[PDB]
Write an enzyme that holds these catalytic residues in place. Sequence first.
Site, PDB file in Angstrom:
ATOM      1  CE  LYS A  19      -1.516   2.594   3.103  1.00 34.39           C
ATOM      2  NZ  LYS A  19      -1.181   3.838   2.356  1.00 34.39           N
ATOM      3  CD  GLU A  70      13.378   4.345   8.574  1.00 33.33           C
ATOM      4  OE1 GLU A  70      13.225   5.475   8.050  1.00 33.33           O
ATOM      5  OE2 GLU A  70      14.087   3.435   8.081  1.00 33.33           O
ATOM      6  CB  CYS A  93      13.286   8.801   7.704  1.00 34.53           C
ATOM      7  SG  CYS A  93      12.018   8.213   6.481  1.00 34.53           S
ATOM      8  CD  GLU A 127      10.004  13.043  11.999  1.00 37.22           C
ATOM      9  OE1 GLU A 127       8.823  12.647  12.128  1.00 37.22           O
ATOM     10  OE2 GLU A 127      10.911  12.340  11.488  1.00 37.22           O
TER      11      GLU A 127
END
Lengths: 502, 502, 505, 505
Positions: D197, D272, D306, D403
């Site tokens: 997906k 992750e 990331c 973040e």
Amino acid sequence: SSGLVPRGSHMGTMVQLNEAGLFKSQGLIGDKWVDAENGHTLPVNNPATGEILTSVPFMGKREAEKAIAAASQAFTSWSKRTANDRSKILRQWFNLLIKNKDDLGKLIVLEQGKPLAEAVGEIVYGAAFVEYYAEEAKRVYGDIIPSPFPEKRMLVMKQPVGVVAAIAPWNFPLAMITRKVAPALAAGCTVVIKPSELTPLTALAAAELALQAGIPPGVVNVVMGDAKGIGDAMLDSTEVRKITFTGSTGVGKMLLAGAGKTVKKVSLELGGNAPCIVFDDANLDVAVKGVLAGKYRNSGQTCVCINKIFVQDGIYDKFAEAFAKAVSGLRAGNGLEPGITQGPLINETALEKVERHVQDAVSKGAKVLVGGKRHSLGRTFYEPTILGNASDEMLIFREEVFGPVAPLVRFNTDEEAIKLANNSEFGLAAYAFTENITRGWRVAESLEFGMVGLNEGLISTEVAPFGGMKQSGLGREGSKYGLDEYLEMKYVCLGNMAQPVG
Amino acid sequence: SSGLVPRGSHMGTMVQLNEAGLFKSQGLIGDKWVDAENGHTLPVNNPATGEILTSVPFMGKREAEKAIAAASQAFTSWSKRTANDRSKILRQWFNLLIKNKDDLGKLIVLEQGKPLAEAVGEIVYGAAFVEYYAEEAKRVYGDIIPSPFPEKRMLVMKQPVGVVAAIAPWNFPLAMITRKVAPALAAGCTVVIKPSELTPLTALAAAELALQAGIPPGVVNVVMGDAKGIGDAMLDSTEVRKITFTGSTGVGKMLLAGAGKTVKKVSLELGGNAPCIVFDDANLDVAVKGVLAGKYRNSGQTCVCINKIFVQDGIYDKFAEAFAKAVSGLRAGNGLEPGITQGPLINETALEKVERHVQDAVSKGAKVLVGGKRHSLGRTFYEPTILGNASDEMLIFREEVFGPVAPLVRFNTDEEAIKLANNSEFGLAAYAFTENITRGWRVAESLEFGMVGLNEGLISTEVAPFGGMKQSGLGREGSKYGLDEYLEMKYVCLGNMAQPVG
Amino acid sequence: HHHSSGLVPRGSHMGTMVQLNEAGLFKSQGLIGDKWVDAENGHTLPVNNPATGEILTSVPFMGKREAEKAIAAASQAFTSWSKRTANDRSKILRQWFNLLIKNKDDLGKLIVLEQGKPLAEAVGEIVYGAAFVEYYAEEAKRVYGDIIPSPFPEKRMLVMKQPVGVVAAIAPWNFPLAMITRKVAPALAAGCTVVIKPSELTPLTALAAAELALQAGIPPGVVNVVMGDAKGIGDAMLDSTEVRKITFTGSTGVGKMLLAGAGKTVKKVSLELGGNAPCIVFDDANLDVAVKGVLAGKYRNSGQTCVCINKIFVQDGIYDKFAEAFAKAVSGLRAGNGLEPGITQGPLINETALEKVERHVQDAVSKGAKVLVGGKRHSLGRTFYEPTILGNASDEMLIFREEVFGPVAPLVRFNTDEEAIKLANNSEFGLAAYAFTENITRGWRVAESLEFGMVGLNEGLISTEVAPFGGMKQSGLGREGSKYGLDEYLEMKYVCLGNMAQPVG
Amino acid sequence: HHHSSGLVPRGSHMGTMVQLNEAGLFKSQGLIGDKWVDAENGHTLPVNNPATGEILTSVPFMGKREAEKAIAAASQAFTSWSKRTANDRSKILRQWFNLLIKNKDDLGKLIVLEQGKPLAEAVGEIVYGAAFVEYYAEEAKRVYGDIIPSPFPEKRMLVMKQPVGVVAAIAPWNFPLAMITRKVAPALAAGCTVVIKPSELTPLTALAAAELALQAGIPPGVVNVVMGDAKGIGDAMLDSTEVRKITFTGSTGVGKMLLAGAGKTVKKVSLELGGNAPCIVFDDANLDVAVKGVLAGKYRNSGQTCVCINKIFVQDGIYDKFAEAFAKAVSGLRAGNGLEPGITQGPLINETALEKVERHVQDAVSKGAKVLVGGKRHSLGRTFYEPTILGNASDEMLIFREEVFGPVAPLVRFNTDEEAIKLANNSEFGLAAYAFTENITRGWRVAESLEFGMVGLNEGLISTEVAPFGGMKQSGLGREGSKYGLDEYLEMKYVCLGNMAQPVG
């Protein structure tokens, strides 16, 4: 009459090879295709016809020195490329070998004689080492070792050994070249290779394709002619850090002794005398097919060839009958002809050794079940032969025949066969056929040989380590371990190191 | 007068060693402690006093043949034990070496001369190989390799090579024994070891402790005397499959040549000529301490000893001053005395080589900064020396001094020092001192040496691979890789295999 | 002091309990940091001998507060323990290994007392459990990092492996020592600290093991042992930030809840859950090897092993001969107290276990199974059950579908190899499986085909510290034993060095 | 057919879309087995270009039913794909690698269109993403088993490694190709099949990659691509028995829910999640290396990586010189449409991302941060944000704690090495971290000390397929890239052979 008068019988094939850029008459030193310094040459002959294919240079010491100097000059840059960079170039070489496999197969047939199906198979197998080591170049891993000293850190690096000298025999004119050149180049070494003077053309064609792949000049150099003079230049050179040889035991032992004066790394593969044990509970069809393949591939001229077959008393008669029927189906002839499954022996010396082995066996009581004479084609064709009632006093039991002769030795107990199989100074391949799990694992563990085929007569592959124990060799070719032969380990100890924070 | 008149100066120490069962005057062959066949002997002398410690047998060919036969007989059973079984026994040997370390250290001092702290440290270090390979025995892993043939399965087994012949030098009378014997026994091999005739007692004591640990008779055999006759018996033997040697380059090259006739596996460690580069950005205290330790350990008599020091122009004066102050703190004497940090050179030949190197350097312009003469103690004691203004034309730059002499060579650029460091046929240890991460990694990668100390002068450890590149050797000792020297790889190919179900 | 005083309850095996108490191995407290402790409210739970019903002692009934204190002690100890050299940890772990072996006979007796297995099996468990301590003492020194060839000329690439942090461990009752060491040894070797919750049914052996760890020089707080309210303790382990890894062996239902709960803090999780091991006896099996192997693989620990054979598929040609020889083998087993020599079957752990065995047998017999041997509670009563063989078993039976964890062997006849392998693979279990065949091709094929983490091929006893144990599918995650077992307790770190120079010359 | 017809919406970059459509790389359907399909109810979602607002195309809005059908196709394909030789899978995977590289320029343009990054970064992503395909084509042949020395003379011990089964993969929008190949390549190499997906924000690149997989000879059902109702699809992946492994890259909150949900079937999970990467610039850093490295590590993909640098700790002695040189470097960046040459910053993915950046900047300035460069929406509008540097940042600011995923660099002054390392380690994140120092001891110390899965030491660009990438603590489980990445898709099997004989002679 008017018309073309060819000097040889396969001009169309040689013309097609030449049009493909695969027919060479010169050696390769650095960025030049070269003759010998005095223009002397040696003929390369077709063993099935006797015809000269072409001349090649008769080189010696001076040309070998020039090739070593070219390799030494090329090493600095080649060794400092990334593994990824070398890998890409080696894959291009692999692809070119496969693209040209049908023509390269025909070239092996012309100079060495094996059937075309075996020759094309040799290209696929030989090229596979190029692919394997293109991938493995990127997997030369170093280590970080836990340090027992708090203030030190410990590393292991692995780096290319330097210039390599390689000497290859005639029985696999392509695969014996790539088995040595591919790992050397992958590690970051450069090479000087001396192919067999009997079958140099395939090595030269492979080197042309290496240049087309983008292998820089001087990374691969090919010289031939005076094998002793070339070998002595390789041994005397300071810059040659490693030497790899496949060939006769006597020559290999002299090379290994000679390498001692400069402490070179040496890997070598020498004579084998492979025993094959057929136990009472072998699957008969599997055993017959496996022994036929393991004995008669390349007309018996393989380093891993079955040399002697120990057959257990209970299966002896059924095996001897089915095996004779299988051997009778083999067909000798020119390898370019369809349906041919046995080529000629490489030369008259090889034929005379086969005749000596057969005469000795028959004089000591062996029974000729099939064959036992020169083939009706003459030249160096020998009939596929089976010798029944063989024994440990026969020359064929004690020494490597390198021809299409299968001696059968009856035995009673498993322990008897294993002890006999292990009672020699050879240690290359051995084979066993049994359906039982305990017996099969036991025999494989017990055999004092570098390779064991268990219910298999065709064991060759680039993914596994090949080489000999005892007097059959040092080092391995194929597998991850094959690359270590071309590397030096380096331990790096970092001192005055600090403790981690928090 | 009435009273004890000892023949030697350390009777109390020798009596304590003898009471502990560690003082031997015979070799070990199978299940017996033995004399030479004709009862001839050779003296073992204390280098600090000149006194005879004891006689030991002067054995040759015949005793070496008997030891090889005992090892061959013991191999069958020892090799077939589980790894766990061998591991338990080897750990018992390790524990006994450590339990007896103080007495064993004193025995090294008596026969070889190094300071007691260094000798006890050698026991701890040497015993560590026994522990390491007791653990590694259980970690001899084979492989299952993905087969490109659907009907085949491919395995790699690793099995002991057979009887090992080992030859050890005098500079580490215990650790050079265990570095060879421990991996051999762990793999399942048996051994015949010839320690140095100058320092055999420690090897005999170690062998007594091996017997006490439960190592079966014949697994370890110790012979000494006629080194050439013993070595020739080791080379001529069919049953000796592997030979390991540490010692002089000239002897090693002859051994390697001689091993070629039976295609033995060989590992060897020969002369080194270790360069040490002190860059302008070195931490001065770290560099002075590291160079002092790396040069003067064992009075310079180590195979990894710093032989020549390249010092960058900017740090030269400060390094030379601080290094001279550090060297002036060394104290020569009998190794059993407290505060002694330099023992005597092994013999008069070693002393004469040191004097030859110093005389040659001074004749070519070197400046004596410290030392440069025989010590006031006489015998084979030599003052710790520093030679300034050294150059590449000096004997000490080109050859291994094996003594307490440090020559300093000024250099300007990093590239100049690295190219000079790499311009020899030696390839054992090298050293570098720099605080910079890029420079440090670069120098470690660039050096063509088997070991590199980076901000470290003491690099020895059992956990990392030790050995030489170029003419300094073949193979490695220590680390997981050290065990591979004693194993043969075997590829097993299973055929006629089926596809998994569902 | 008079023999009539009741402070110590009188009972059987008092000499053994006194000898254990004198050896410092009989505990009635948990271990948190540098103290042996009671629960904050002084609550306790009894530990009873399953063969006699007698009380051995009580242990604390701890919960959330004590688990939090144990985690805090482990977190405080981690900083120093993780920064020791591998060699330093290895030496201390070998001292613990040596102490376990030195005390093996007494420790074996303690396992018999609380868990019930025969003394020979209990002493064997000490040797096996201690072997993990030795193995990981050696492996601590072999946590290797990597140097990877860099495709960028100006970069160098390293892989380091470092301890994950505080570990929470939960162990079951069937191996009271080995389930503790299989988790604690690799954790400590890597440089982690632990909080372990042994089974409340068999906590004494864990406490004895922890006393020997302290005697070995394992610093306080490196090993902490708490027990009682398993849910409260487990929730404290899951809720803690500092707990970076959980390891659990036990029931599938509990394991699935722990795995779900670990998701909220992204913990590393390894677990070993229910198995339902098939055993395939092919027509060409060596009959003696199969009978002996199935006997061992089924009836060790009275069938109460994670890897015990649960159902046996027997090929049509060998069925009758196998069933006859197997029944004769099983008839030799002897139930009783594990401290009596000659006894080879101990009692089931508790009445719940006995009732499950009875439910499986009743269900099988109601669906057509034939009782060949046993099939009832043993004459000793309590939780002793007769070793049983059920012939004519089928895939509709509860014992085919679910883990029996008792001394009952159901036999299912089959015709083809493919049929047996597909049947063996048709479940959500994936722990152990077994096969017996003399043929090399068939043996390798079945071993490759089976969808199980462990396969015994011509072997009914597969347990070892040197090989990786764990489950596929719903039987677990991760492995215990072998070099790979240590990776469960490590985190990989990639270090990329830039601005690097080309080598000279 | 007349240019005034509106069937294809007219717009910018139509030539590029036509060239992609002609190359077979522009898709408006998902892939299930041997068919390209719509959703069962024909619902769709639009894919818009973030730099222009224009529609590229629609893709299906699929859910549970389509995900179930994709899983069934993958399960059917697994049997045959897993039983091919490694060499056979390797050849096919190399054909896919070669097709990705052959089509890199068009694929790069497709990433620019849907995700917005500059074309040079998008073509670089194709080369990097394709590298995983090559790497695992090679590694497929290197799935080695073991032969372990047996402590039992009569037994031999093997370890086999076999594919886990059907894999469910969920990928984010920031690397529309590389996040697909990082998961699909190792899965296929091991012998698994996949249901992936992709992000509903950037699904086109995944569909193009899947078309090239089919052209490479990857059999139908080995790769299946579904998108739309992410929750419904994810729940079908979690509920399926046949899905044995999940791999997810994306937000921490979603990842934690997937990990919890995977517990009910004991799936293998690798993931992750969010990172909050600290970067430490020590006083002895090489200034030029640090400036260049921080520029690259912060502003690649406009900060939407990331592993992007989130907060920079700068030692007191170098602060002023670093801040000045870093501002000058950042001033060179140029925002715009990624198909325009010379552009080095693309737009943020959507308005939610822009609002988060504005929230972080406003919070920092309200707590005393100084805007050194930028600090506002770019004059282009849409979701373009000016590259920003915030001086005088602190640990109370939202940008320090969370973040940002945008082009904002906060600078935090520090005094001692120990202070910076403890600060860098004081979070629940554990993905990437960075450090700049010229000293060998300090560099190794910081790399060892940092509690992060990846460390750049004198390097701001660490991404590579050859090394293991993933997070510690709450940043993830498992690794991608390197030999270790393949282990995520394998199950270990221990095989114990019994009744073995001693070798002869």
